[PDB]
Amino acid sequence: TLDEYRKHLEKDAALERRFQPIQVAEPSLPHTIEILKGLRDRYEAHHRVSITDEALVQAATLADRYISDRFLPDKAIDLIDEAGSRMRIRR
């Protein structure tokens, strides 16, 4: 992470010199929707439920808009996982 890179890895300049940093940026909304579409199969298999495309779009949009403490790819998956668990316990 950026904080760990600055706080710890930069205290040893000789070790930090031997690495080439690469920036991994937070994905945009369409990229998050594609990721959710990709992981829908695995999450449906684990939770024994079915997820609609509208559910993925709503999860991505709502996570991007309202939840502001984390970053997009994870907080969108969290809503889907929580919904799956809530639906599973109801049986």
Binding-site residue ranges for ADP: 17
DSSP result, the chain: -HHHHHHTGGG-HHHHHT------PPP-HHHHHHHHHHHHHHHHHHHT----HHHHHHHHHHHHHT--SS-HHHHHHHHHHHHHHHHHHT-
Tokens encoding 18: 């031997």
By C-beta, is 1 or 68 nearer to ligand ADP?
1
* Among 16, 41, 74, 78, contact with ligand ADP (rule: CB under 6 A): 74
Min dist. Cβ of residue 65 to ligand ADP (A): 19
Regarding 89 and contact with its own copies (CB under 8 A), the answer is: no
By C-beta, is 73 or 87 nearer to its own copies?
73
**Contact positions toward its own copies, by CB under 8 A?**
1-3, 6-7, 13-14, 17, 20, 23, 70, 74, 78, 82
